Design a protein around this ligand. Structure first.
Ligand SMILES: Nc1ncnc2c1ncn2[C@@H]1O[C@H](COP(=O)(O)OP(=O)(O)O)[C@@H](O)[C@H]1O
Ligand SMILES: Nc1ncnc2c1ncn2[C@@H]1O[C@H](COP(=O)(O)OP(=O)(O)O)[C@@H](O)[C@H]1O
Lengths: 274, 281
């Protein structure tokens, strides 16, 4: 066990940031209900959820980017009283030692949630995948592996033997997009009407959760970015966020909003998903 | 493009693990530290937002130092600066810049700044920066960091954080002239943390029970206060035998978990350093 690798994992891979609550996650009502029931409760009380009825050792969250997979991973950790380790699969590419160290550290910090983003690149190098399967199969340890992917088609039958529950985390529905605007705007000075909120919701069809969050952030900076020179005005004097700030924000975010393959995800979800 | 001579993997490591992709942080998410918040809005955030107006020497500083004991909100502040300035946020511990291999630490520092340049405006947050700016590889990575910090189409802000501001070398100190003391939460800030965190839960605390929680958490950090609420939130399910709201007993039990990790800090050292070298409030 190299102390420099241990340091790297403790400093950069282990999460030390704010906790995440269920209410921070908009939509995905089914995923949240299922995770609470089959993952978090058994993680909190393995003395009652014995079995068989214990938590899975591995799950898969899948869907397009920015739908809340990492958020859900962090929430699993927070709500189960666990430590959270987050790493992208490519950062493992020494790789074998990194994987081993990652599980060793997690074992010392139990219960632990290990979140691996783009896990498809790990499960398809051969040597890294082998050591990872060694580690997950071995995992008595209170470790949950949460894999995330935008490419579930690259998660094969052998990988599905390890990631035994798989949940589709889709783009937010209208109700979820509304949820996000209201939640983020409640933290700001904002003067939107209910009609204007509905318009924002209608105009953000196909936006991800991350796009909705960047929309709101851009909208929040609109007032300051709209002041013309004449510096008298101090922060407390600036006007509230208004519909125009959102219309302007749409012009920033919409060009980064990707247009399509929900088919692939829905197909896979019907086949292998909860 | 400006990245064609860096190794693809070093780029992707910085892009994946060092660059933050997490939720935004708002000023209201940070309890207490009124002086630091007001100051930072004025001399950092507004200039970063309106560099058409805040030109030349009215621009933001190239670097600032946050100091105090662990868990007081330094990283939270760094991320809030980025959020509120419309900037990308990169966070790294100083030890993660170092390597056993000759020339590799310097390479990582150079890569970090090159990726930040591509993603500008950018905030680069460096934890335990005293280690980086200490007092041959240590000498060399320090020198390289200062080259990057010294080297203006650039819209990069370095935010260093330390529990040991006395150990930053004098020369390096001149690069971070703005130094803000981020202390342990005072009683009103502890209360605010409890209220904010319990507003997201099912909770039945009386006003008196809250005041009792605040009295009993003297000397707790913001992180301690957060761990306290987290442990209290899990009390109801942990009290079931083979769900009720959070109550005062869950906090009393939570105190027995958190308190063993809370120990007295050298607050005189921070206060004295803030008086002599810092912004003074
Ligand atoms: N369902 C959601 N509800 C609220 N916010 C979300 C949701 N999904 C994404 N976000 C916002 O976007 C950010 C990025 O989401 P993340 O969980 O990293 O997405 P993924 O891992 O699915 O790509 C989050 O930290 C959050 O601010
Ligand atoms: N001033 C504060 N207000 C609210 N929460 C805080 C504060 N300080 C710390 N916390 C909580 O503790 C966590 C860790 O704090 P962090 O900002 O990493 O501290 P530091 O960098 O000072 O060690 C934060 O993500 C937050 O949940």
């Amino acid at each position: 066990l190299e102390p420099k690798m241990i340091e790297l994992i403790m400093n950069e891979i282990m999460d030390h940031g704010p906790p995440v609550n269920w209410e921070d996650i908009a939509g995905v009502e089914f995923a949240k209900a299922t995770i609470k029931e089959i993952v978090v409760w058994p993680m909190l009380r393995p003395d009652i959820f014995t079995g068989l009825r214990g938590p899975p050792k591995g799950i898969l969250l899948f869907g397009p980017p920015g739908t809340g997979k990492t958020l859900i991973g962090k929430c699993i950790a927070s709500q189960s009283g666990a430590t959270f380790f987050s790493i992208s699969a490519s950062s493992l590419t020494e790789g074998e030692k990194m994987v081993r160290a990652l599980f060793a550290v997690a074992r010392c910090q139990q219960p632990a949630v290990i979140f691996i983003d783009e896990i498809d690149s790990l499960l398809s190098s051969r040597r890294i995948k082998t050591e990872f399967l060694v580690q997950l199969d071995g995992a008595e340890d209170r470790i949950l592996v949460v894999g995330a992917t935008n490419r579930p088609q690259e998660i094969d039958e052998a990988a599905r033997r390890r990631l035994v529950k798989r949940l589709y985390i889709p783009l937010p529905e209208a109700s979820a997009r509304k949820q996000i605007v209201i939640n983020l705007m409640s933290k700001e000075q904002c003067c939107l009407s209910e009609e204007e909120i509905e318009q924002i919701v209608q105009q953000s069809d196909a936006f991800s959760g991350a796009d909705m969050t960047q929309l709101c952030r851009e909208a929040s900076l609109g007032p300051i970015r709209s002041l013309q020179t004449a510096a008298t005005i101090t922060p407390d004097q600036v006007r509230p966020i208004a519909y125009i700030d959102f219309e302007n924000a749409f012009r920033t975010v919409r060009p980064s909003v990707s247009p399509k393959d929900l088919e692939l995800y829905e197909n896979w979800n019907k086949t292998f998903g909860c």
